[PDB]
Amino acid sequence: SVVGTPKSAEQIQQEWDTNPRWKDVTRTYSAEDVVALQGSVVEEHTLARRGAEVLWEQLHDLEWVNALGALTGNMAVQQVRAGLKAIYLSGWQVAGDANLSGHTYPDQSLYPANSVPQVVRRINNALQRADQIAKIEGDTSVENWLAPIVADGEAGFGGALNVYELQKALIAAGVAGSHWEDQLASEKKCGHLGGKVLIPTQQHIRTLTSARLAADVADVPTVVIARTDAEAATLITSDVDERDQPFITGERTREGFYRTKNGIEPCIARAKAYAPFADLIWMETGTPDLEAARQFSEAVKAEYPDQMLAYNCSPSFNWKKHLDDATIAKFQKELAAMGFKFQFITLAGFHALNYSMFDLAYGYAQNQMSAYVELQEREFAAEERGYTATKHQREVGAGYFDRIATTVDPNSSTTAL
Amino acid sequence: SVVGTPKSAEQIQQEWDTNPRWKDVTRTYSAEDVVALQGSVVEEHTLARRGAEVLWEQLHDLEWVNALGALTGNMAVQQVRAGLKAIYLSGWQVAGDANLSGHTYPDQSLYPANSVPQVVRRINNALQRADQIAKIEGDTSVENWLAPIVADGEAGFGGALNVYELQKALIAAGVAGSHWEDQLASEKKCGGGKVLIPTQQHIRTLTSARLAADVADVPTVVIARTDAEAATLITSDVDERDQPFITGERTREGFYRTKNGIEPCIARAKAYAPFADLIWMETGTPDLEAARQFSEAVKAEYPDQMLAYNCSPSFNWKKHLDDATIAKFQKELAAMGFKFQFITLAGFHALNYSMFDLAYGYAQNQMSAYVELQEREFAAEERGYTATKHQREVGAGYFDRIATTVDPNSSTTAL
Amino acid sequence: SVVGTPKSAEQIQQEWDTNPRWKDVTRTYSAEDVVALQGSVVEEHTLARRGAEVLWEQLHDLEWVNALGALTGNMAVQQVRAGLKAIYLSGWQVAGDANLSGHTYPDQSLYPANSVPQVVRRINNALQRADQIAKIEGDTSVENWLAPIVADGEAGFGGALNVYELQKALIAAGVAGSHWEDQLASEKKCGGGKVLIPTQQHIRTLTSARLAADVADVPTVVIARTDAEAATLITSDVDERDQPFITGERTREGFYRTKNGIEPCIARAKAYAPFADLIWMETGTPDLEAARQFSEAVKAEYPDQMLAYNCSPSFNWKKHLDDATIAKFQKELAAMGFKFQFITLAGFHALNYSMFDLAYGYAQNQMSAYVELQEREFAAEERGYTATKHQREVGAGYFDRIATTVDPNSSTTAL
Amino acid sequence: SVVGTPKSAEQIQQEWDTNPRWKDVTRTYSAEDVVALQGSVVEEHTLARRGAEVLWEQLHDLEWVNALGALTGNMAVQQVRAGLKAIYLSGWQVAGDANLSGHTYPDQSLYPANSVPQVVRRINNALQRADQIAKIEGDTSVENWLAPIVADGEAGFGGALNVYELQKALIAAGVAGSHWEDQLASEKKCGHLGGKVLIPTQQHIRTLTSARLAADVADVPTVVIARTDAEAATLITSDVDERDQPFITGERTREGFYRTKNGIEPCIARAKAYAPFADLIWMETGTPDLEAARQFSEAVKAEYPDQMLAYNCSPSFNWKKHLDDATIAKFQKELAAMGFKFQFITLAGFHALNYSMFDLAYGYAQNQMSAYVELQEREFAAEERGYTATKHQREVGAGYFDRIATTVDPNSSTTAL
Ligand SMILES: C=C(CC(=O)O)C(=O)O
Ligand SMILES: C=C(CC(=O)O)C(=O)O
Ligand SMILES: [Mg+2]
Ligand SMILES: [Mg+2]
Ligand SMILES: [Mg+2]
Ligand SMILES: [Mg+2]
């Protein structure tokens, strides 16, 4: 058998040289380095490849791509049924309510490192079932059930090899893109002079290089997002990288961390340093602020006018205390005009799930079935916008499995499609 | 070490004889049979014991115990924060969106048999974190975070040993009660209907589940479910109790056609009563008259037998009922002896609907839709909702306190 | 994007019609039935396809394909390093020491149904790491590290849909072949014997497994196993092919007593042949005459039908056979058409014995026992053993090369 | 219900004050700090408590406790049947052939952090089945099937909270003791001036404190082992701790690591610093050397004469090239005389499994059944020393489950025990 024969270094190099996908993508390693790590057989990763291709297309065709955080398969199925074209997989949400430890965790890289890959695979499985059901029912209402997944890679749960293995695991599960941040969450100092701890610029370039190499060895054009936490971070592990030295204050704490001046300047500097190694750049920010977004946007594009940006819209910001309805209403459109082509709400699923269950359960504790009928009536109404989960058996594939059982029975006949 | 030394057959026997918990509980096996299966060390199962005890207490003190299906830890945390005293763990919901295969399945015992135990363990982990947070914050608003969990056991994923291992795994995870049904879902004929198993086989199932609870040394609550209302087929006519409803026709698989309805459900419920702490007649449409007839027929032989009731999540409740009937439904049922009531698919509907509504709003208006949800969350704070404070909701202050305890240059707040 | 576009019903049909792989393969369903179950995108399964292709090739080129049971990744790596061309994945061994419950189980389909797929995936991961290491080291001593895997499918853990999902999960993990048996282990009567299912039900199982392979678009090798040599009971007399052996007596569970032996195994094998790439008569004692009689009876109707043979790990081989018979056993069987042969429990015995012998030596003499094992490992290097270089065996040089690739101040060795 | 009611701070403090177990055990946190983290209900951890108690007993009664690395449940069952009184759970072996990623990994904290806890739970399950079988068969030949498990905790997969969560997960699975090392494996530099990277002394005291606190909050007297990697390590993350400064050379690498003088001196210094926080101390060493063992032994006991030590006997050292048979034969007895009360071979299971399968498979590839009969004959012979796995069905519990099935059947009767 010749199934899965690797490409040659020449073919790979030629694709890096000629495919517009790799315009302005720096790989400090060689095509031979990639082939040297592939063994004799390269597994195809169908969903990871299709998702990365679809995601790149969409980022260049649509006015922007927006997404909500999904932590279960059904959540993602509903996001797609409602008309979204991408799925965001929050590591925060996974820590909170969907990781392999079984525990509720805060957002400090506490959960087992293969947790997000498992949820990626779950989400793709759920979308695949929605697509199977759609096909056997002649449902053409959704063009692409297999929406690309953008997954939270945290800072990789360790060093370069941890980064590599996480990216490989995300790719195997069918991820379309992954984001990677330049902090050490496990040493977040929670005292009064504490805060987030950055790692040196060169180390995050190491992380982004590792992630790209895992994609190359897996032979898929995964979308790579660099996140910088330098807006708020007050500490950094080391001053060894001279690009970081302009912000070093000269103080070192009792734990050995270096105090560093934070804000938009180091975020601009780090984004420029990361741009050659990142398909998109993301400045984590506490306050939604169109002006600060524009300033970061323009500083980065002054050196890299084609560099695409990513934007998280803060779920904890008190939006309506601080912005009027019109600013809220135009926020994403403005950001998209500035180059933020991927935008998302990290904790959408957490809030929807916790709120809907609290509201239903509170009603239920006081009035039993009357609360449930309020929810059921809203579901019935929602049928008008395309909601289908009111037909619960069919939603989870009962018709699909009946068809399988009928296919297998030689005395029952299947309906022609 | 003496940790975990088993009891004697004598102590076990005396507890079966004198503890009011075991009035009306038949064990066809012996206390020696139990001790023989325990080895040299018996692991303590704190959460399974405490949950089963609280569940029994509540079933005898409150007017009724009700619950909503939970498929995530946060879901159960919110149900308890909102004032519920029990959690229902739907295997249907687990098939749909929370099982170890990673796949979306319909309700036919397709998922790996240890999936529900994992979700039990997750739910307990989440309630324990809520309890930890409440303690360090002086929050007394909820008196018992560790609400008892009642879990779906399907028909055990096989034979008596499969039942035994599932009950053992549910107990290990900290389950308080488990329900067990008398159908073979993996042979549901689809041309058809559900296929029952003989009455004696389900008595075997209930005996297996009680034996696993005994060997684990916890007073787990056992719920027997009968699917005889709707089931049209049965695997065999070997049981004389099943023969009155056998028509005599056999399908191409060898299954026997059987008259379904409330009559075989009353018969099977009476057969199951000695082996079940609660009895549940699965029904498709909510029907107070059918519930009353089943209740009364069963209590005519076992006036103390407690019953359980699923309130249909798919029934178009209102299309068919006025607001007052809907509002009194559970109270009427409770008066009939239905002391555990639940909505199996509450979580599935809350999750799917809330995400569809948010996502549709978002696709059309971006941040304005999220702001609608956020404002509703703010409003809900007035009723005790706390998840707007998201970091604290998932334990950020708790883990900060651990970090402060471990740091010798920081001092911990005294409680 | 066009990635993963399904084939047409027409292409599938033509491949079933013209590819020699599907000579003598009956599909009672249609190509349209297959396309209807594929959705819009078909995931490629590289390892399942390559393994199934290599396995079919080898079964037609070599005198016979033999294998040992592997329950860990390293076990399979050593089997291939030693020169074997296939891996056997024992579900018995998985029950005993490698299943997702964490428990030690006997051989009664007690473990979670996705456990064997996980071990398939693990074994492939381990072979892939060995292949990676060999490449960066210029090691050509092994031509194919990715030996095809044949996995135990039990009886599917339920009905047709359970079979379907198990085959799908085995393919997803990269399995090359899977075997499926016609008993209900979860009802093994223990007073007793194995309980068969009707012939038509196992044809349903094999059809389910072929359908799952088709929908996944891989030419998985399907092995049908019959337990009719020893089984004394059967669930139903509904199948006319089973009736000649029914005695007419029924047990208290409703099972029918049936004459066991080679005769019902020949009958069932002939019934299964159109739906099976290989046929396997489970047998307790190795018996060349019984193997010859079964082989010849089956090939009288299907002269091209390939057979599979488990060589008993519990038989006291030698107490009963001279050295020359033992030495020729597999070659004789191969001459009879047994083209896949294996020892189910090779790994269980190698693991348990090597650890008992080492640990006993250690308990009595501490380091001297370990030094005995280490010296034997050194000696084995002469035959190609490499695990004495332990860091390199588990990938230390490979991950060093990744670290060197990622570091822009270090240069990588050219291959 | 009152099941699982927590103890008061007073009871806890009184046990720390009066129980000889806690003689010379420093806790820098308070009993109130412990109670503050326990919520309203404390789960009992039966096997973790019994294993920690049995392990402490054995460490004080026997001349020493020795162990072999086990990576499957059957391996541990065989170690106990052969007469060992403890089980060692190698994280190396778990990386190599038994972790939740499914992948073969080298020993660099690459696998998901809950992997060892899963194997602990597996090993206890396997021993529990052996004990059940023994009881129903009247097998009294083994006194304690539930041998204590000592598990590899690596350096905790991150910071203090990662350490805490791993220790809690090990305790929940029934671990008896856990060991913790002072290196950052994920930044091991593999170049020519590379090597292992130490963390500051104060940080490892933080790790050991965290591990003790997780045990206290879980209410079990888990055995805590500190390992130092300073014999060979050439780098350290920071020079901020003045106890480390004597060995700092003054050079810092391009990655920001500090070059540090290695050997037995920093191992003695670190062991002394760790002793108040560790039930046993372990100097990782490359060469088995009774003299170096004695020197480390005596330096530590000069300040802490009662401090127990732990010793790994190197599986890669070429024992018979470098030591005569008599030294090999007396090695553990000598070490025990010097205070090494827990001794183990980390990779015993890896070598036994890989070698036995290679030997069998090589024989099999050339001669089919003749190779298997050689193995079977050795098993038959081994029956004489108590080996039972030749009876394969009974070994994995077939008799136990037949008894369960017979217990459940009201028309079959059980055998009286
Ligand atoms: C809440 C989050 C989650 C995260 O850190 O990924 C944010 O606002 O970015
Ligand atoms: C091989 C090992 C494994 C380990 O690092 O724990 C050693 O010798 O210590
Ligand atoms: Mg995160
Ligand atoms: Mg169900
Ligand atoms: Mg088997
Ligand atoms: Mg290790």
mmCIF file with all atom_site columns, C-alpha atoms in Angstrom, chain A residues 1 3-4 29 33 35-44 46-47 49-50 53-54 57 121 128-129 131-132 135-136 146 160-161 164-165 168 206 209-210 213 400-401 403-405 407-408 410 414 417, chain C residues 1 3-4 28-29 33 35-44 46-47 49-50 53-54 57 121 128-129 131-132 135-136 146 160-161 164-165 168 204 207-208 211 398-399 401-403 405-406 412 415:
data_model
loop_
_atom_site.group_PDB
_atom_site.id
_atom_site.type_symbol
_atom_site.label_atom_id
_atom_site.label_alt_id
_atom_site.label_comp_id
_atom_site.label_asym_id
_atom_site.label_entity_id
_atom_site.label_seq_id
_atom_site.pdbx_PDB_ins_code
_atom_site.Cartn_x
_atom_site.Cartn_y
_atom_site.Cartn_z
_atom_site.occupancy
_atom_site.B_iso_or_equiv
_atom_site.pdbx_formal_charge
_atom_site.auth_seq_id
_atom_site.auth_comp_id
_atom_site.auth_asym_id
_atom_site.auth_atom_id
_atom_site.pdbx_PDB_model_num
ATOM 1  C CA . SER A 1 1   ? 0.000   0.000  0.000  1.00 0.00 ? 1   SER A CA 1
ATOM 2  C CA . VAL A 1 3   ? -1.807  5.251  1.297  1.00 0.00 ? 3   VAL A CA 1
ATOM 3  C CA . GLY A 1 4   ? -0.562  8.313  3.125  1.00 0.00 ? 4   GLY A CA 1
ATOM 4  C CA . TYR A 1 29  ? 12.948  25.876 9.957  1.00 0.00 ? 29  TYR A CA 1
ATOM 5  C CA . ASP A 1 33  ? 13.134  19.667 8.891  1.00 0.00 ? 33  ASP A CA 1
ATOM 6  C CA . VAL A 1 35  ? 9.833   15.955 6.287  1.00 0.00 ? 35  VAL A CA 1
ATOM 7  C CA . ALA A 1 36  ? 12.381  14.614 8.784  1.00 0.00 ? 36  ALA A CA 1
ATOM 8  C CA . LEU A 1 37  ? 9.633   14.505 11.483 1.00 0.00 ? 37  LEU A CA 1
ATOM 9  C CA . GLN A 1 38  ? 6.894   12.795 9.441  1.00 0.00 ? 38  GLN A CA 1
ATOM 10 C CA . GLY A 1 39  ? 7.958   9.169  9.556  1.00 0.00 ? 39  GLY A CA 1
ATOM 11 C CA . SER A 1 40  ? 6.802   6.977  6.670  1.00 0.00 ? 40  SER A CA 1
ATOM 12 C CA . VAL A 1 41  ? 3.044   7.666  6.806  1.00 0.00 ? 41  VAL A CA 1
ATOM 13 C CA . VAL A 1 42  ? 1.178   10.940 7.219  1.00 0.00 ? 42  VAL A CA 1
ATOM 14 C CA . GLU A 1 43  ? -2.363  10.632 8.535  1.00 0.00 ? 43  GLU A CA 1
ATOM 15 C CA . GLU A 1 44  ? -4.889  12.776 6.719  1.00 0.00 ? 44  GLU A CA 1
ATOM 16 C CA . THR A 1 46  ? -9.850  15.870 6.912  1.00 0.00 ? 46  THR A CA 1
ATOM 17 C CA . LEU A 1 47  ? -11.766 18.198 9.222  1.00 0.00 ? 47  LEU A CA 1
ATOM 18 C CA . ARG A 1 49  ? -7.757  20.829 6.698  1.00 0.00 ? 49  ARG A CA 1
ATOM 19 C CA . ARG A 1 50  ? -11.280 21.689 5.570  1.00 0.00 ? 50  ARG A CA 1
ATOM 20 C CA . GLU A 1 53  ? -9.303  26.303 4.435  1.00 0.00 ? 53  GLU A CA 1
ATOM 21 C CA . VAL A 1 54  ? -12.877 27.466 5.107  1.00 0.00 ? 54  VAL A CA 1
ATOM 22 C CA . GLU A 1 57  ? -11.564 31.865 2.911  1.00 0.00 ? 57  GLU A CA 1
ATOM 23 C CA . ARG A 1 121 ? -13.558 16.512 18.622 1.00 0.00 ? 121 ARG A CA 1
ATOM 24 C CA . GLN A 1 128 ? -21.331 15.984 11.780 1.00 0.00 ? 128 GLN A CA 1
ATOM 25 C CA . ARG A 1 129 ? -24.513 14.558 13.270 1.00 0.00 ? 129 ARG A CA 1
ATOM 26 C CA . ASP A 1 131 ? -25.119 17.453 8.851  1.00 0.00 ? 131 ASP A CA 1
ATOM 27 C CA . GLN A 1 132 ? -26.097 13.755 8.593  1.00 0.00 ? 132 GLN A CA 1
ATOM 28 C CA . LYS A 1 135 ? -28.905 15.313 4.476  1.00 0.00 ? 135 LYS A CA 1
ATOM 29 C CA . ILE A 1 136 ? -31.364 12.514 5.211  1.00 0.00 ? 136 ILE A CA 1
ATOM 30 C CA . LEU A 1 146 ? -18.891 22.027 9.579  1.00 0.00 ? 146 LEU A CA 1
ATOM 31 C CA . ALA A 1 160 ? 7.881   24.181 23.268 1.00 0.00 ? 160 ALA A CA 1
ATOM 32 C CA . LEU A 1 161 ? 7.169   20.448 23.284 1.00 0.00 ? 161 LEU A CA 1
ATOM 33 C CA . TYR A 1 164 ? 3.762   21.177 19.847 1.00 0.00 ? 164 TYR A CA 1
ATOM 34 C CA . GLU A 1 165 ? 1.799   18.294 21.346 1.00 0.00 ? 165 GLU A CA 1
ATOM 35 C CA . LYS A 1 168 ? -0.979  18.250 17.149 1.00 0.00 ? 168 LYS A CA 1
ATOM 36 C CA . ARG A 1 206 ? 9.338   29.969 20.068 1.00 0.00 ? 206 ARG A CA 1
ATOM 37 C CA . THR A 1 209 ? 7.101   28.598 15.705 1.00 0.00 ? 209 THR A CA 1
ATOM 38 C CA . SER A 1 210 ? 6.354   25.350 17.520 1.00 0.00 ? 210 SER A CA 1
ATOM 39 C CA . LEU A 1 213 ? 5.763   23.353 12.905 1.00 0.00 ? 213 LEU A CA 1
ATOM 40 C CA . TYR A 1 400 ? -30.555 8.825  11.406 1.00 0.00 ? 400 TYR A CA 1
ATOM 41 C CA . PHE A 1 401 ? -30.248 5.729  13.572 1.00 0.00 ? 401 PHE A CA 1
ATOM 42 C CA . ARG A 1 403 ? -32.371 4.709  8.945  1.00 0.00 ? 403 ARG A CA 1
ATOM 43 C CA . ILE A 1 404 ? -29.232 2.764  9.885  1.00 0.00 ? 404 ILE A CA 1
ATOM 44 C CA . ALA A 1 405 ? -31.368 0.053  11.488 1.00 0.00 ? 405 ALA A CA 1
ATOM 45 C CA . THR A 1 407 ? -30.597 -0.204 6.081  1.00 0.00 ? 407 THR A CA 1
ATOM 46 C CA . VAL A 1 408 ? -29.266 -3.191 8.006  1.00 0.00 ? 408 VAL A CA 1
ATOM 47 C CA . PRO A 1 410 ? -33.040 -6.974 4.763  1.00 0.00 ? 410 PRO A CA 1
ATOM 48 C CA . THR A 1 414 ? -35.109 2.670  2.870  1.00 0.00 ? 414 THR A CA 1
ATOM 49 C CA . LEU A 1 417 ? -33.263 10.625 -0.947 1.00 0.00 ? 417 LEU A CA 1
ATOM 50 C CA . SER C 2 1   ? -13.375 23.925 0.035  1.00 0.00 ? 1   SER C CA 1
ATOM 51 C CA . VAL C 2 3   ? -11.970 18.461 1.044  1.00 0.00 ? 3   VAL C CA 1
ATOM 52 C CA . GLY C 2 4   ? -13.750 15.242 1.934  1.00 0.00 ? 4   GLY C CA 1
ATOM 53 C CA . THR C 2 28  ? -27.989 -6.669 1.191  1.00 0.00 ? 28  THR C CA 1
ATOM 54 C CA . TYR C 2 29  ? -28.104 -2.839 1.239  1.00 0.00 ? 29  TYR C CA 1
ATOM 55 C CA . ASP C 2 33  ? -28.113 3.523  1.241  1.00 0.00 ? 33  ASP C CA 1
ATOM 56 C CA . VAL C 2 35  ? -24.280 7.570  0.383  1.00 0.00 ? 35  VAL C CA 1
ATOM 57 C CA . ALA C 2 36  ? -27.424 8.520  2.302  1.00 0.00 ? 36  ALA C CA 1
ATOM 58 C CA . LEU C 2 37  ? -25.593 8.003  5.620  1.00 0.00 ? 37  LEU C CA 1
ATOM 59 C CA . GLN C 2 38  ? -22.482 10.034 4.781  1.00 0.00 ? 38  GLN C CA 1
ATOM 60 C CA . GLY C 2 39  ? -23.603 13.618 5.169  1.00 0.00 ? 39  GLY C CA 1
ATOM 61 C CA . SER C 2 40  ? -21.712 16.277 3.206  1.00 0.00 ? 40  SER C CA 1
ATOM 62 C CA . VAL C 2 41  ? -18.142 15.403 4.256  1.00 0.00 ? 41  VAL C CA 1
ATOM 63 C CA . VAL C 2 42  ? -16.369 12.053 4.610  1.00 0.00 ? 42  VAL C CA 1
ATOM 64 C CA . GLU C 2 43  ? -13.412 12.027 6.998  1.00 0.00 ? 43  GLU C CA 1
ATOM 65 C CA . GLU C 2 44  ? -10.410 10.162 5.627  1.00 0.00 ? 44  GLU C CA 1
ATOM 66 C CA . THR C 2 46  ? -5.533  6.906  6.769  1.00 0.00 ? 46  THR C CA 1
ATOM 67 C CA . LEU C 2 47  ? -4.451  4.185  9.208  1.00 0.00 ? 47  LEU C CA 1
ATOM 68 C CA . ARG C 2 49  ? -7.408  2.158  5.108  1.00 0.00 ? 49  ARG C CA 1
ATOM 69 C CA . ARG C 2 50  ? -3.697  1.443  4.943  1.00 0.00 ? 50  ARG C CA 1
ATOM 70 C CA . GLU C 2 53  ? -5.117  -2.836 2.472  1.00 0.00 ? 53  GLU C CA 1
ATOM 71 C CA . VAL C 2 54  ? -1.865  -4.258 3.831  1.00 0.00 ? 54  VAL C CA 1
ATOM 72 C CA . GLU C 2 57  ? -2.352  -8.064 0.588  1.00 0.00 ? 57  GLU C CA 1
ATOM 73 C CA . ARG C 2 121 ? -5.528  4.186  18.797 1.00 0.00 ? 121 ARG C CA 1
ATOM 74 C CA . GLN C 2 128 ? 3.964   5.738  14.623 1.00 0.00 ? 128 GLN C CA 1
ATOM 75 C CA . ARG C 2 129 ? 6.485   6.869  17.238 1.00 0.00 ? 129 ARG C CA 1
ATOM 76 C CA . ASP C 2 131 ? 8.475   4.703  12.775 1.00 0.00 ? 131 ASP C CA 1
ATOM 77 C CA . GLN C 2 132 ? 9.372   8.358  13.492 1.00 0.00 ? 132 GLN C CA 1
ATOM 78 C CA . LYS C 2 135 ? 13.339  7.515  10.225 1.00 0.00 ? 135 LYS C CA 1
ATOM 79 C CA . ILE C 2 136 ? 15.432  10.087 12.064 1.00 0.00 ? 136 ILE C CA 1
ATOM 80 C CA . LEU C 2 146 ? 2.470   0.211  10.849 1.00 0.00 ? 146 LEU C CA 1
ATOM 81 C CA . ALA C 2 160 ? -27.126 -3.636 15.374 1.00 0.00 ? 160 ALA C CA 1
ATOM 82 C CA . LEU C 2 161 ? -26.573 0.007  16.269 1.00 0.00 ? 161 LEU C CA 1
ATOM 83 C CA . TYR C 2 164 ? -22.267 -0.139 14.037 1.00 0.00 ? 164 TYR C CA 1
ATOM 84 C CA . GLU C 2 165 ? -20.872 2.343  16.542 1.00 0.00 ? 165 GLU C CA 1
ATOM 85 C CA . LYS C 2 168 ? -17.042 3.028  13.392 1.00 0.00 ? 168 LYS C CA 1
ATOM 86 C CA . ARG C 2 204 ? -27.356 -8.796 11.011 1.00 0.00 ? 204 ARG C CA 1
ATOM 87 C CA . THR C 2 207 ? -24.052 -6.661 7.844  1.00 0.00 ? 207 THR C CA 1
ATOM 88 C CA . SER C 2 208 ? -23.951 -3.852 10.400 1.00 0.00 ? 208 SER C CA 1
ATOM 89 C CA . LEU C 2 211 ? -22.153 -1.097 6.560  1.00 0.00 ? 211 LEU C CA 1
ATOM 90 C CA . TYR C 2 398 ? 12.800  12.606 18.357 1.00 0.00 ? 398 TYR C CA 1
ATOM 91 C CA . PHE C 2 399 ? 11.627  15.300 20.758 1.00 0.00 ? 399 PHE C CA 1
ATOM 92 C CA . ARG C 2 401 ? 15.010  17.028 17.176 1.00 0.00 ? 401 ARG C CA 1
ATOM 93 C CA . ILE C 2 402 ? 11.751  18.945 17.518 1.00 0.00 ? 402 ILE C CA 1
ATOM 94 C CA . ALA C 2 403 ? 13.390  21.206 20.111 1.00 0.00 ? 403 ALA C CA 1
ATOM 95 C CA . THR C 2 405 ? 14.094  22.507 14.833 1.00 0.00 ? 405 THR C CA 1
ATOM 96 C CA . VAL C 2 406 ? 12.242  25.100 16.893 1.00 0.00 ? 406 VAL C CA 1
ATOM 97 C CA . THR C 2 412 ? 19.349  20.133 12.534 1.00 0.00 ? 412 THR C CA 1
ATOM 98 C CA . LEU C 2 415 ? 19.042  12.937 6.862  1.00 0.00 ? 415 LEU C CA 1
#
